[PDB]
Paper text:
Although the active sites of the improved variant structures superpose well onto the wt-structure, all selected mutants display altered loop 8 conformations. Notably, mutant αsA6 was crystallized in two different conformations: one in which loop 8 adopts a wt-like conformation, referred to as closed conformation (CC), and another one where loop 8 is unfolded, referred to as open conformation (OC). Interestingly, variants αsA6 and αsC6 exhibit enhanced lactonase activity against γ- and δ-lactones, while αsA1, αsB5 and αsD6 show reduced lactonase catalytic efficiencies. This emphasizes the fact that the improvement of the phosphotriesterase activity does not necessarily compromise the cognate, lactonase activity of the enzyme.
Phosphotriesterase-like Lactonases (PLLs) are appealing candidates, being natural lactonases endowed with promiscuous phosphotriesterase activity. PTEs and PLLs belong to the amidohydrolase superfamily, and share the same (β/α)8 barrel topology. SsoPox exhibits high acyl-homoserine lactones and oxo-lactones hydrolysis abilities, and promiscuous, low phosphotriesterase activity. SsoPox is a very appealing candidate for the bioremediation of phosphotriesters because of its unique thermal stability, and its ability to resist aging, solvent and protease treatments.
Author numbering:
A (entry chain B), B (entry chain A): 1 to 314
């Protein structure tokens, strides 16, 4: 009993099993949903999330880590409903997802006050329940490391030092944000092995990805199916390359699938190859078979999906 | 009839009576309240709002216009509870309050889609209730007129053209944002007299304030009690000067009081004269007595608090 689970007793990290480290049951903008509930259907969202999780479990997924936090519409009671319907081990997190500035609430507030919110969710529970957070999620993207983005990073480091939960990040693979997150966190005393630098699979710049892995953090090849960021074939070649080059013990793989997401849909792009179905199981249908074909053995798969998450949460 | 009221049948605009055009029963950041409910106490908030409204009614206020919208924590059911407890005429609005970018929901979405949300609230109702919006609120501040800020302004113009409800703005008195809002709205076909340009009382630059009034819009001397923006004495002198200069028929006065607000507390500033009590009734205690004793007659008061709101909502 060391990793808290939604709707269940906590488990030992050694028992996490086959894990999807970055998937979302549901994402929404809190303010839009509060103000215009007519745009949403929680029953449909629930059905969709339950079906996705069930499909993941039939491929052998034991645990799903869901980094939906403030800014992405975290709802612990929705998450509980999915657990009740499926029996999945679900790890919820705390944190703040922003690209530029914090909400107005945080005007005249300290990094310590921010960290206290995270620690509340880890030690006391999330949204008035006894379901506790098992990691912290932070973000940076195109705007880079702004002052408020940096405040949140520093607050995450405080929470990690106090509670030992790991940190998952969102970064932009093309502007060094991930490298900066890793640097700031490690400067503040976070173990590099307690950090997953996200969305590195969005680039085929292997020198950049290795640089981060070499500094001791997990690398998030974590958006399989999101072709608009990087097509599955190029992701697969990069993943294969990294495996070939000895990086299995730093690689984490996921889809960043949002079973439902409320953002406007971007212009389709059509390529010669039929578009992969983005879902929580695309890796079982495409990536893993591809790897196996190219001689990747079962031990690599176990390393990426079992041993790495076990270490991350240890 | 014509102006929709929370928890009541609509009223004719001629029957609006003595109005406070810009007051907030409660403000909060939607995402923070959803994620960390431990920080908030709705029962305390309700008590505080009810007491403030009762005190306003004791001074003869008939109608309060509350421009809490998306970004400020609009909650129509909370508003209904205040009406039930007090009997106030309360005008709720729709709109979006942002300074830089829209929520992620709006990625890949059109100005028309944004306007449709406003029109839904005006024609159908707010948050799943039959309480309808009676105006649109928009904002700009230190970052100026960004592309997303402009989208929201243009969406407000569409909603006004379709429904004839007026537009209230938030601006920064020191960087031309109010002038820009007025210009863009009027260019899009909004009657200048259907616009209240907010927070002009935050400056003593009378030339700037008059410029906006001369272009046909109401001018919001609307933050009485917020000394950190401009002290009450200086506001009073500016208000008096505008009256002396013949601007009564463009002046709107309010406090922008937030009966509760969740933002961190700014550093105190202490001045030689005791700080006035920022509340929903400060103008009865300070401003109005000051005006009358400097020779301002009852007809000016009636113009500012009754006739101007009547015209605005006509
Ligand atoms: Co992300
Ligand atoms: Co304002
Ligand atoms: Fe994600
Ligand atoms: Fe306001």
């Amino acid at each position: 009993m060391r990793i808290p689970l939604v709707g269940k007793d906590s488990i030992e990290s050694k028992d996490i099993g086959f894990t999807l480290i970055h998937e979302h049951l549901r994402v929404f903008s809190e303010a839009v949903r509060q103000q215009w509930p007519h745009l949403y259907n929680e029953d449909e969202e629930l059905r969709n999330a339950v079906n996705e999780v069930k499909r993941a479990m039939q491929f052998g997924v034991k645990t799903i880590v869901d980094p939906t936090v403030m800014g992405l519409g975290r709802d612990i009671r929705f998450m509980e409903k999915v657990v009740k319907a499926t029996g999945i081990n679900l790890v919820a997190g705390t944190g703040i997802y922003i690209y530029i500035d914090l909400p107005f609430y945080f005007l005249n507030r300290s990094i310590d006050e921010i960290a206290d919110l995270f620690i509340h969710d880890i030690k006391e529970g999330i949204q008035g329940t006894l379901n506790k957070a098992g990691f912290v999620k932070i973000a940076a993207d195109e705007p880079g490391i702004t002052k408020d983005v940096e405040k949140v990073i520093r607050a995450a480091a405080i929470a990690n030092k106090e509670t030992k939960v790991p940190i998952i990040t969102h970064s932009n693979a093309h502007n060094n944000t991930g490298l900066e997150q890793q640097r700031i966190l490690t400067e503040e005393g976070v173990d590099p092995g307690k950090i997953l630098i996200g969305h590195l699979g969005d680039t085929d710049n292997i020198d950049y990805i290795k640089k981060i892995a070499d500094k001791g953090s997990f690398i998030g090849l974590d958006r399989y199916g999101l072709d608009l960021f990087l097509p599955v074939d190029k992701r697969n070649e990069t993943t294969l390359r990294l495996i070939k080059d000895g990086y299995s013990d730093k690689i984490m793989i996921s889809h960043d699938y949002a079973c439902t997401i409320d953002m406007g849909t971007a212009k389709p792009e059509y390529k010669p190859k039929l578009a992969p179905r983005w879902s929580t199981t695309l890796i079982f249908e495409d990536t893993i078979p591809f790897l196996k074909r190219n001689g990747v053995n079962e031990e690599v798969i176990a390393t990426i999906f079992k041993e790495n998450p076990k270490k991350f949460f240890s």
